[PDB]
Coordinates of C-alpha atoms and ligand atoms in Angstrom, one line a residue:
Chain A
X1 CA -10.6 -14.4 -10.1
X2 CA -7.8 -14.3 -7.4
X3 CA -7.3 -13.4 -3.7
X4 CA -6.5 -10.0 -3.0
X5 CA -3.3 -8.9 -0.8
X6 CA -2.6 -5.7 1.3
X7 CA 1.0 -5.4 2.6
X8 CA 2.8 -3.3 5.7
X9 CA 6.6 -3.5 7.2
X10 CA 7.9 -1.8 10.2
X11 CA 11.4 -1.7 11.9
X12 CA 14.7 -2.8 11.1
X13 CA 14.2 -6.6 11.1
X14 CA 11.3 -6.1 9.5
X15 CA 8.0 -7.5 10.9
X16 CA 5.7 -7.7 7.6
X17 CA 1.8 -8.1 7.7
X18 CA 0.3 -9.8 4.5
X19 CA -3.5 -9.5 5.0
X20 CA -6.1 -11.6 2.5
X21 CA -9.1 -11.0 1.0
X22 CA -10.9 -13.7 0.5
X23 CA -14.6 -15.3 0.2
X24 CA -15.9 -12.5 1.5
X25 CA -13.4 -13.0 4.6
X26 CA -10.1 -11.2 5.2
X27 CA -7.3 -13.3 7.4
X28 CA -3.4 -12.4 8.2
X29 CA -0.2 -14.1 7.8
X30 CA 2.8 -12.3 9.7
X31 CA 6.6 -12.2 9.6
X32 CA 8.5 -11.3 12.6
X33 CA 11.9 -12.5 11.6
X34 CA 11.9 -16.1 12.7
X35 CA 9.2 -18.1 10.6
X36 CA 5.3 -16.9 8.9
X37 CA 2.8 -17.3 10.6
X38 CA -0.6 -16.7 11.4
X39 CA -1.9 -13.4 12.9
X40 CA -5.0 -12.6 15.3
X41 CA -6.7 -10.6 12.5
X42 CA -9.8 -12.0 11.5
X43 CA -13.0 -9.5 10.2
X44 CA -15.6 -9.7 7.4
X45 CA -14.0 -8.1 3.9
X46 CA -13.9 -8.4 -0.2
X47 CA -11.2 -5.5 -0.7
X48 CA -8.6 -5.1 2.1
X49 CA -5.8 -2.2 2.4
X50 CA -3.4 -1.2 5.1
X51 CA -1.4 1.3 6.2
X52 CA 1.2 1.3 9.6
X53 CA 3.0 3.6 11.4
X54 CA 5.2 3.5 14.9
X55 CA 5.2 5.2 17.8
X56 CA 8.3 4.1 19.1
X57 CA 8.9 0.9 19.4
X58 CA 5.1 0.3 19.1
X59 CA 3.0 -0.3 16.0
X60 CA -0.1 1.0 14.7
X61 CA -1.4 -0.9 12.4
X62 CA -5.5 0.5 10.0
X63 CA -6.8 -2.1 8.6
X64 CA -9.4 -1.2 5.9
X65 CA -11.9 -3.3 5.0
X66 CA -14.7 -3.4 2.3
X67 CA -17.5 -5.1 1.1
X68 CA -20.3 -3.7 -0.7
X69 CA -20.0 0.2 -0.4
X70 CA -19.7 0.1 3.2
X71 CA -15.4 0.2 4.5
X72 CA -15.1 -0.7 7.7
X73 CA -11.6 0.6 10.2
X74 CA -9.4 -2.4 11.9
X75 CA -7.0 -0.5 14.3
X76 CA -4.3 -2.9 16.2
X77 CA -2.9 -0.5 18.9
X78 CA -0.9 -2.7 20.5
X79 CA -3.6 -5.4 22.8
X80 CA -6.4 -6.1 20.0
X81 CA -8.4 -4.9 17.0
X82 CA -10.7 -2.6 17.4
X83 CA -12.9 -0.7 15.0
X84 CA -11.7 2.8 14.2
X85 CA -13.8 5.7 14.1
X86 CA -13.2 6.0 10.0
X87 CA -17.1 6.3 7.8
X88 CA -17.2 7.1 4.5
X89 CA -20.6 8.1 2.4
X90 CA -19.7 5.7 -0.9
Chain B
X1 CA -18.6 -6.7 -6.0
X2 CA -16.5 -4.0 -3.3
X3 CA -15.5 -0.5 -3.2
X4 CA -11.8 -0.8 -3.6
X5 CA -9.4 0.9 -1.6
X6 CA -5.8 2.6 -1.1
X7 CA -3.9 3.9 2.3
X8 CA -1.2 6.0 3.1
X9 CA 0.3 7.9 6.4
X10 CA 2.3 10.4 8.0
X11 CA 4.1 11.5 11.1
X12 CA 3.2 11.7 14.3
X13 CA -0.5 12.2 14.6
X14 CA -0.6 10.5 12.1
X15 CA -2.5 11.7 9.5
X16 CA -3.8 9.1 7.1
X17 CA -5.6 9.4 3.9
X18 CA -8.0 6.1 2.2
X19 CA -9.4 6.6 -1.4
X20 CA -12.2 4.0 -2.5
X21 CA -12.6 3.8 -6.3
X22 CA -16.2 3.1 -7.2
X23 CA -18.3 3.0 -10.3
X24 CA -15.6 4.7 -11.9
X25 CA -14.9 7.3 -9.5
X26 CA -12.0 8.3 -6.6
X27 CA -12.6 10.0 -3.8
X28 CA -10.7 10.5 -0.6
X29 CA -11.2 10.4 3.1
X30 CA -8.9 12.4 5.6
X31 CA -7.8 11.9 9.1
X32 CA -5.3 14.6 10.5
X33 CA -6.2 13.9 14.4
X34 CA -9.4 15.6 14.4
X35 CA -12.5 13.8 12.6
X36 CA -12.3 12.5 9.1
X37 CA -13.3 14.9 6.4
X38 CA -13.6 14.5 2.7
X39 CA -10.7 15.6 0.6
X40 CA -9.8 17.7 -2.0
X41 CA -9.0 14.4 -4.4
X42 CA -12.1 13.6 -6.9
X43 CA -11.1 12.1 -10.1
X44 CA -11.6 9.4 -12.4
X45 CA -10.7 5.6 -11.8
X46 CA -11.2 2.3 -11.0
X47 CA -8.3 1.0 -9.3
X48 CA -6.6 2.9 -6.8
X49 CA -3.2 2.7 -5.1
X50 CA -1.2 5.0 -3.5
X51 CA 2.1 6.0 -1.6
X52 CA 3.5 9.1 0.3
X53 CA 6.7 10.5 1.6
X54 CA 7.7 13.4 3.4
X55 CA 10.1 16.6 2.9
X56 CA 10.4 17.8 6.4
X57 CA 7.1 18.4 7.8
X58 CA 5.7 18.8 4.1
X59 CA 3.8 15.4 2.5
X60 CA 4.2 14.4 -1.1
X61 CA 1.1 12.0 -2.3
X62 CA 1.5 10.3 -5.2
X63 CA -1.8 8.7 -6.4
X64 CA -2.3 6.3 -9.5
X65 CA -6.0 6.1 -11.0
X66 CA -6.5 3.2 -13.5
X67 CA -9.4 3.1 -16.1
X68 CA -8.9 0.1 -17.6
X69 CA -5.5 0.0 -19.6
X70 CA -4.1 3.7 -18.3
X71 CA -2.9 4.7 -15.3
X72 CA -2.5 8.0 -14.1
X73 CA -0.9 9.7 -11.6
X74 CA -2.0 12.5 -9.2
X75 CA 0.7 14.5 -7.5
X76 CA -0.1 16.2 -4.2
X77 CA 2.7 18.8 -3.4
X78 CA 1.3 20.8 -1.1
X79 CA -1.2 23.2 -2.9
X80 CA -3.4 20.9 -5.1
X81 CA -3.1 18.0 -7.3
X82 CA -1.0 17.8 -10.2
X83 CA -1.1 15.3 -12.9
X84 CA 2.0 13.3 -12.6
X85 CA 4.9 12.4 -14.8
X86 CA 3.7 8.5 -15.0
X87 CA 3.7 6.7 -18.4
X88 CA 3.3 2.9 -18.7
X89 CA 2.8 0.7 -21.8
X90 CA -0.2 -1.7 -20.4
Chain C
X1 CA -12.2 -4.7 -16.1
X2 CA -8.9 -2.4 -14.9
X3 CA -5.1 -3.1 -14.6
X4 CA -4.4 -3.3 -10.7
X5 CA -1.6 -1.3 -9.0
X6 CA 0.4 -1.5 -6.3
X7 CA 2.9 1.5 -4.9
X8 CA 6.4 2.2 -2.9
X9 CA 8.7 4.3 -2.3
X10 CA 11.4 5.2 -0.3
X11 CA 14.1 7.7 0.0
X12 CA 14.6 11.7 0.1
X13 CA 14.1 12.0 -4.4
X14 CA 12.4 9.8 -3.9
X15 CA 12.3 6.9 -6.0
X16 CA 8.9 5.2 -6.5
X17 CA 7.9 1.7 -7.9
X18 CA 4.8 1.1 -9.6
X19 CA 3.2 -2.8 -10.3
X20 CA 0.8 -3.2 -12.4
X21 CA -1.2 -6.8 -12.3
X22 CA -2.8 -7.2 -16.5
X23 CA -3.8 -10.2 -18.0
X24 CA -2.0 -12.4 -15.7
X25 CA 1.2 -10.7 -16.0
X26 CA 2.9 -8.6 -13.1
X27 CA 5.0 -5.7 -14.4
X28 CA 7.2 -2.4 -13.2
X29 CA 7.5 0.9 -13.9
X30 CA 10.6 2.9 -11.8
X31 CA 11.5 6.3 -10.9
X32 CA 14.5 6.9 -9.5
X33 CA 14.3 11.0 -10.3
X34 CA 15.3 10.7 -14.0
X35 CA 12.2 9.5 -15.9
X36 CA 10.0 6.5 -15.6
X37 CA 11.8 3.3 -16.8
X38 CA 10.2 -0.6 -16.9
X39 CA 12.0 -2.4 -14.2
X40 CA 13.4 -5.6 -14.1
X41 CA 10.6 -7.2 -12.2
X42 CA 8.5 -9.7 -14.7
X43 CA 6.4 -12.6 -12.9
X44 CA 3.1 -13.9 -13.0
X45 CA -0.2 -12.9 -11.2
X46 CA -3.6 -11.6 -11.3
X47 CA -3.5 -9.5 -7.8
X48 CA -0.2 -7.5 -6.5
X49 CA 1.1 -5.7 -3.2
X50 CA 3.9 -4.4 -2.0
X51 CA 5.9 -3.1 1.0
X52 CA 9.4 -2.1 1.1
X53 CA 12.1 -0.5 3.4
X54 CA 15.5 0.5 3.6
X55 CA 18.2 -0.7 5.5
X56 CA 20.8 2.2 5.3
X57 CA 20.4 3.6 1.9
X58 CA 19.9 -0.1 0.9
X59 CA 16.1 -0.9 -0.5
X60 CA 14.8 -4.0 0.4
X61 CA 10.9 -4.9 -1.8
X62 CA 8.6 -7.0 -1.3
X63 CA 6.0 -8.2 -3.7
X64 CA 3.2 -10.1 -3.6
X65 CA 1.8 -11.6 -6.5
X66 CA -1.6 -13.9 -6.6
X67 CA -3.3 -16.3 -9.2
X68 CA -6.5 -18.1 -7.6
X69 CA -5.3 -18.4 -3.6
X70 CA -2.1 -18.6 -4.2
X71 CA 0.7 -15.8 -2.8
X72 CA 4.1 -15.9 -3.8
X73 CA 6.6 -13.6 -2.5
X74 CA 9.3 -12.1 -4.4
X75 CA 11.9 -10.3 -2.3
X76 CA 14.3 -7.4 -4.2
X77 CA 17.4 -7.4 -1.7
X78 CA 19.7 -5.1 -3.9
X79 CA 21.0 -7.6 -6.6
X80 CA 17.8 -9.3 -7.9
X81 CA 14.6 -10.7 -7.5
X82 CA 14.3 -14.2 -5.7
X83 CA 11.3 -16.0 -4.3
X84 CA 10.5 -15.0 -0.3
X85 CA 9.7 -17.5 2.7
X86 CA 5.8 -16.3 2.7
X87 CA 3.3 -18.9 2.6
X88 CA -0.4 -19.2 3.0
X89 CA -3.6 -21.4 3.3
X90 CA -5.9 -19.6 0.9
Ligands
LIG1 C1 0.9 -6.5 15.0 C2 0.1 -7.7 15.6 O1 0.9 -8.9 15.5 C3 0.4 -10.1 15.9 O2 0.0 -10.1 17.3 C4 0.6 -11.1 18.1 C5 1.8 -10.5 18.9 O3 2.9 -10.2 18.1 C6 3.9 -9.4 18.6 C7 5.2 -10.0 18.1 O4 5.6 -11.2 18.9 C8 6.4 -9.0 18.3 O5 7.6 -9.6 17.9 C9 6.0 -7.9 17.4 O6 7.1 -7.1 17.2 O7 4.9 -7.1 18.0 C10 3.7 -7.9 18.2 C11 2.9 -7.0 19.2 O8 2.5 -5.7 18.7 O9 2.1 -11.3 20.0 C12 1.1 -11.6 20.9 C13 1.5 -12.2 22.2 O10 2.7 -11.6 22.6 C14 0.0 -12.4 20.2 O11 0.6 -13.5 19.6 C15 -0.5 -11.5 19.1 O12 -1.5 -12.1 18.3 C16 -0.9 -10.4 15.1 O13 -1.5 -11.6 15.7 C17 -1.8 -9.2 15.3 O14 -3.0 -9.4 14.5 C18 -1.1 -8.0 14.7 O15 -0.7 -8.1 13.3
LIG2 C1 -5.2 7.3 13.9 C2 -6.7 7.2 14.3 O1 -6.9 6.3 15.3 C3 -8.2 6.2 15.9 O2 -8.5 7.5 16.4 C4 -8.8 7.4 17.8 C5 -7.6 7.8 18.7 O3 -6.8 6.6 18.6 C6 -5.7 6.6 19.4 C7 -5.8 5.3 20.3 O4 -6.8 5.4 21.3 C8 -4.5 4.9 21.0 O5 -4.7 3.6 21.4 C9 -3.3 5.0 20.0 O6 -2.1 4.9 20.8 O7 -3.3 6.3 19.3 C10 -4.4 6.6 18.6 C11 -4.2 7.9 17.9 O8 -3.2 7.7 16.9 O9 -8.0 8.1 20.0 C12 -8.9 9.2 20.0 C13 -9.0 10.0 21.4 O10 -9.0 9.0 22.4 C14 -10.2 8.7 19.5 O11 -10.7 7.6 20.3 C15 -10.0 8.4 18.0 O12 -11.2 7.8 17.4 C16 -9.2 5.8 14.8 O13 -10.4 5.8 15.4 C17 -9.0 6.9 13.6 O14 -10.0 6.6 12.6 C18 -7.6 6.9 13.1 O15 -7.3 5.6 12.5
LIG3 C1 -2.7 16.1 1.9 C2 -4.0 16.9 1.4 O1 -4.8 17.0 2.5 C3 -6.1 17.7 2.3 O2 -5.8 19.0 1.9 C4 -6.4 20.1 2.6 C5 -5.4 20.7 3.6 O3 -5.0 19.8 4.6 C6 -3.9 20.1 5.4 C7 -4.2 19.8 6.8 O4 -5.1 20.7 7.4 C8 -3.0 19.7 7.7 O5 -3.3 19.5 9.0 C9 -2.2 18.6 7.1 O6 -1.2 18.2 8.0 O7 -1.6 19.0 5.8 C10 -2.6 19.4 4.9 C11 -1.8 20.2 3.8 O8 -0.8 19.5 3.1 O9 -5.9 21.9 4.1 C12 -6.2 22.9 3.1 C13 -6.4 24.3 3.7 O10 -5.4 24.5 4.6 C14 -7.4 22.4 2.3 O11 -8.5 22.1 3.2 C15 -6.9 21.1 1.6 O12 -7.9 20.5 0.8 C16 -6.8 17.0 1.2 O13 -8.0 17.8 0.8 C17 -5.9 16.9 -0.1 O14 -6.5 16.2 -1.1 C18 -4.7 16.1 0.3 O15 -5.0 14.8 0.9
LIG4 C1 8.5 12.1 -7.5 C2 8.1 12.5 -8.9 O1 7.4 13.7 -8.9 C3 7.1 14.3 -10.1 O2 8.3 14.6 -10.8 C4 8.5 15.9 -11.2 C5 9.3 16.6 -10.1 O3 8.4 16.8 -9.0 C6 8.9 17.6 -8.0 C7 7.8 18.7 -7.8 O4 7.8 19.7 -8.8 C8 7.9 19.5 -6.5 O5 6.7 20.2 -6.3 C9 8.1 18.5 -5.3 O6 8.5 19.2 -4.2 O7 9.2 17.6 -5.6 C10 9.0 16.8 -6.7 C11 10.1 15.8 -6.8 O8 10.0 14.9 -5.8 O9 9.8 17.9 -10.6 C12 10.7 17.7 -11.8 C13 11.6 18.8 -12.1 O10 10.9 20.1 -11.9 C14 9.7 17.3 -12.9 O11 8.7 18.3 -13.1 C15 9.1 15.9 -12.6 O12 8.2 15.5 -13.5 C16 6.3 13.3 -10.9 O13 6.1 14.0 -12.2 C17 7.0 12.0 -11.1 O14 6.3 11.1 -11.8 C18 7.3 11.4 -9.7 O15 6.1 11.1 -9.0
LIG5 C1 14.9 -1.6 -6.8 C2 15.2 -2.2 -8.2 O1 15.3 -1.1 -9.1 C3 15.6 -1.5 -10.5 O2 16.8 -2.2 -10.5 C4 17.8 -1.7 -11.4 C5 18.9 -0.9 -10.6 O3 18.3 0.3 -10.1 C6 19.1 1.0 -9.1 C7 19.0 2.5 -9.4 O4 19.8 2.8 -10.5 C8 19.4 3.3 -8.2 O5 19.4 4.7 -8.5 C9 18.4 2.9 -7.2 O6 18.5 3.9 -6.1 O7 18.8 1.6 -6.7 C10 18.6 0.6 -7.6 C11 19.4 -0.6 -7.0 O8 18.8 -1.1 -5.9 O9 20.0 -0.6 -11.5 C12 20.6 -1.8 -11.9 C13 22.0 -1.6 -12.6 O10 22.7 -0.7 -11.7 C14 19.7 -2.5 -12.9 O11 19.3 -1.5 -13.9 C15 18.4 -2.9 -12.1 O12 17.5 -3.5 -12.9 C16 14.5 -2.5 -11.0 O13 14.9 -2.9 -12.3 C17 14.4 -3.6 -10.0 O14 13.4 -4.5 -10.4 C18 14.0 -3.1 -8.6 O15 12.8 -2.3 -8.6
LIG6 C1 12.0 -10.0 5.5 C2 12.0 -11.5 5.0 O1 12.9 -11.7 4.0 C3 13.1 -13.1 3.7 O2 13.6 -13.8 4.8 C4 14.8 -14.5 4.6 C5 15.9 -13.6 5.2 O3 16.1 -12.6 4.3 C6 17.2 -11.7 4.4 C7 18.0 -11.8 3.1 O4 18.7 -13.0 2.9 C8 19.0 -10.7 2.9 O5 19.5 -10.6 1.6 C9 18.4 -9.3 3.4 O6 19.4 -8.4 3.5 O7 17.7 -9.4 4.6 C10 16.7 -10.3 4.7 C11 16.0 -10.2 6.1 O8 15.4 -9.0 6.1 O9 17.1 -14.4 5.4 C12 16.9 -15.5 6.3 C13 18.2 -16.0 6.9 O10 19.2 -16.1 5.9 C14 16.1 -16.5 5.5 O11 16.7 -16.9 4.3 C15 14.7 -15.8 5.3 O12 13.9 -16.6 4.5 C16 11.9 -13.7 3.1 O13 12.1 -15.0 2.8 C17 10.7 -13.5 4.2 O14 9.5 -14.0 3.8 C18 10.6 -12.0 4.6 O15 10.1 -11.3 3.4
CL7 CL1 8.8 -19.4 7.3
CL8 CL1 -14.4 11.1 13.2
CL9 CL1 9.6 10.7 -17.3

């Protein structure tokens, strides 16, 4: 078995988030042009996908995250990760 | 084991759209500003990915169901889905 | 057991790349409005993403590809696949 990736880009450098299932726990490595590194996202998860979008100059980043039959939200809105309204019935 | 799932969004809203595959099946979740609902998608997989692009204001979905060596894709157009062009030798 | 896919696109036909992770082997399947065709893109891994964007009507992919906890990054910068910056502590 392997780790599991999920992968966004915005902009015209482009900033790149590579998030990582793993063990049961999903963590981030980001690109904003100048070096990887590590990002601030750091929840509970064994299946992880993304999608992004901006508004602006800003980004909005979902984060979804699974274990069991329960998926969980991640939104980054610009100041921290919050959990999004999103519920499913699997 | 997970639920496994796929994201995809548009515009200005946004509107975003998550399928989870599980025990065989793929359903879909909807956002379009308002409450998620549970969308017209329902059909047979278990690995899901997807991707989306827009004509104007008008979203093109393109989803690809996998049972174990086929994958298939699922068009949405803008009335209902569509089995899609797709062929792979897996 | 399932193949794994990941999905991009970009572009007003549009054209669409599809990955498909089987038995170790990461492989592509491209549409660029004029059938499917299997893609230049041929490297190892158990687990693949992707993101992509365009810079002008230039397409820039990236792919991640995984065996165990490792992520390798494979960048498509309009002449031919090359291994990316990205690393990890998985
Ligand atoms: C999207 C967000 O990115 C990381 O958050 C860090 C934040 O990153 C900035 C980054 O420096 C900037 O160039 C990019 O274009 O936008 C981000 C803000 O939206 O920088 C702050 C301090 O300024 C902290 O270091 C943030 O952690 C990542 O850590 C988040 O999880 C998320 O991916
Ligand atoms: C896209 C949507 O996002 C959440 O929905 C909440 C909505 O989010 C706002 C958010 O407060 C704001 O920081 C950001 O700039 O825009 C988002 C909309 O795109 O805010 C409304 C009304 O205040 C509710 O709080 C919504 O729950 C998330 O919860 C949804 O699942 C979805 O991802
Ligand atoms: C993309 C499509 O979305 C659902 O389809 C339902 C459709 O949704 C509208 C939605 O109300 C609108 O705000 C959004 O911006 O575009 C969609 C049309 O492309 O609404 C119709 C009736 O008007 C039905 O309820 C559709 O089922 C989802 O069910 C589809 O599977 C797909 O994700
Ligand atoms: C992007 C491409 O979509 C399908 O290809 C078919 C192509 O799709 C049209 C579709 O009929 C139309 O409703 C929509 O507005 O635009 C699509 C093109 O983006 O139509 C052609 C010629 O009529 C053929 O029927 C194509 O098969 C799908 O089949 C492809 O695999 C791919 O996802
Ligand atoms: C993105 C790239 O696509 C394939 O590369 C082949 C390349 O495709 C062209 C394609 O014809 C053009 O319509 C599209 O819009 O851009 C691509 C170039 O960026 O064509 C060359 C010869 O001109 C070769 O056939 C390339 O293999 C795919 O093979 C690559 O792996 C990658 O997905
Ligand atoms: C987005 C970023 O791409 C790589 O970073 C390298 C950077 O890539 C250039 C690339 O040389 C060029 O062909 C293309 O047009 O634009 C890319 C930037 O978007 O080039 C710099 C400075 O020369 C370094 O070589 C970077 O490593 C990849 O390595 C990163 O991980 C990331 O995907
Ligand atoms: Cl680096
Ligand atoms: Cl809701
Ligand atoms: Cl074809």
């Amino acid at each position: 078995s392997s780790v599991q990736t999920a992968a966004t880009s915005w902009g015209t450098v482009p900033s790149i988030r590579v998030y990582t299932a793993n063990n049961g726990k999903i963590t981030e490595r980001c690109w904003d042009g100048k070096g990887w590194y590590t990002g601030a996202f750091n929840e509970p998860g064994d299946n992880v996908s993304v999608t992004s979008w901006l508004v602006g100059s800003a980004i909005h980043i979902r984060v979804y995250a699974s274990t069991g039959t329960t998926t969980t939200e991640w939104c980054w809105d610009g100041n921290g990760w919050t959990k999004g309204a999103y519920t499913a019935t699997n």
